[PDB]
Ligand binder design. Structure first.
Ligand SMILES: *[B]([O])([O])C1=[C]C([N]S(=O)(=O)C2=[C]C(S(=O)(=O)C3=[C][C]=[C][C]=[C]3)=[C]S2)=[C][C]=[C]1
Length: 358
């Protein structure tokens, strides 16, 4: 790595780990389409296992980007349409509040107030049906955005139905494999457990708990190497051989709604570059990120814009992640940590680094 990248990365990350008391962390900077790695501390404190380029971290909601791209791919294959009613793929969803709710609304959190979390009691398949049948929207479709696992997780579940494949089989066959993300998992296999870092919450070692729609909304675990490949693939979809995947990536990066200075794609969120740092830094704080906000439709949607700061934060009880990239600049960053620390601190560090590199 050029001394310049090494310099900004270490001068930015070192203080971060110290002030946030982060046990372990891995960072990847993609500069001119080439990846450079950095690792710090521990993946498992007790057994003194250091973080390495093979350490698996829980991505949390960064998993939503994979779900968005998998849905985009399904659209490109002509298996589903974002214009399709939710009921077309789940006829059992007969309650009338579901009438004007399309796959687009589910994918972009604009269905009308679906909750950030699926209740813990909802476990079985019929459990899930009852939950959505009983849900009472607080707003009409397409008027308010409320970041929700129950919205995009359902989008992910329905989107793979015409394929005949299970969500994880679809994700493996159509996204991970074609992209060579060979150490990216929804269920980590026994043989790879040795690379699975522990997350830390108040000194306690923890891992994400299973839950309804978890694979779709926050269940991916991955390495800093696989994540840098994910960033490269999203920075340059044109150089992806599988046609429907290249398209799916562009569809996930298209602008569907605008809220403040942000635009909602499928999983990914974007802003026009150059961007005002405080706009992305303050916007990443949950007081704003998780708040209900009115949206303006982009009719029709704007196709992926090269000059964008495309990003997504992610967290589990024990991990904190962040991905951001500027296509026009062939520049990107991945930050994986085994401690959930505040989003603003993550975006500011990413900003400090990327602004320095170009
Ligand atoms: B996503 O990372 O934005 C996301 C994921 C989940 N589900 S989960 O099991 O990963 C959990 C994440 C947390 S948390 O990050 O402490 C939290 C975030 C926001 C609101 C409450 C808790 C707990 S379980 C849920 C929400 C967002």
């Amino acid at each position: 790595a050029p001394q310049q990248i090494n310099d900004i990365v270490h001068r930015t990350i070192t203080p971060l780990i110290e002030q946030q008391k982060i046990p372990g962390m891995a960072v990847a900077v993609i500069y001119q389409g080439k990846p450079y790695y950095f690792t710090w501390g521990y993946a498992d404190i007790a057994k003194k296992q250091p973080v390495t380029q093979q350490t698996l971290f829980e991505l949390g909601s960064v998993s939503k980007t994979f779900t968005g791209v998998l849905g985009g791919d399904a659209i490109a294959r002509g298996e589903i349409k974002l214009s399709d009613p939710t009921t077309k793929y789940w006829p059992e969803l007969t309650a009338k509040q579901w009438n004007g709710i399309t796959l687009l609304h589910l994918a972009t959190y604009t269905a009308g107030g679906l909750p950030l979390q699926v209740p813990d009691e909802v476990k079985s398949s019929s459990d899930l049906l009852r939950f959505y049948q009983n849900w009472q929207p607080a707003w009409a479709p397409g008027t308010q955005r409320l970041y929700a696992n129950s919205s995009i997780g359902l989008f992910g579940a329905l989107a793979v139905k015409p394929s005949g494949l299970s969500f994880e089989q679809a994700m493996q066959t159509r996204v991970f494999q074609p992209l060579k993300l060979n150490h990216t998992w929804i269920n980590v296999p026994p043989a790879e457990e040795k690379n699975y870092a522990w997350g830390y919450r108040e000194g306690k070692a923890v891992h994400v708990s299973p839950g309804a729609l978890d694979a779709e909304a926050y269940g991916v675990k991955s390495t800093i190497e696989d994540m840098a490949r994910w960033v490269q693939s999203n920075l340059k979809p044109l150089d992806i051989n599988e046609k429907t995947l290249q398209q799916g990536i562009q569809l996930a990066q298209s602008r569907y709604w605008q809220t403040g200075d942000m635009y909602q794609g499928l999983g990914w969120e974007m802003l026009d570059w150059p961007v005002n740092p405080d706009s992305i830094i303050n916007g990443s704080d949950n007081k704003i990120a998780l708040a209900a906000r009115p949206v303006k439709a982009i009719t029709p949607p704007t196709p992926a814009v090269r000059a964008s700061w495309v990003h997504k934060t992610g967290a589990t009880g024990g991990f904190g992640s962040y991905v951001a990239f500027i296509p026009e600049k062939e520049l990107g960053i991945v930050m994986l940590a085994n401690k959930n620390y505040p989003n603003p601190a993550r975006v500011d560090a990413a900003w400090q680094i990327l602004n320095a590199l170009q």
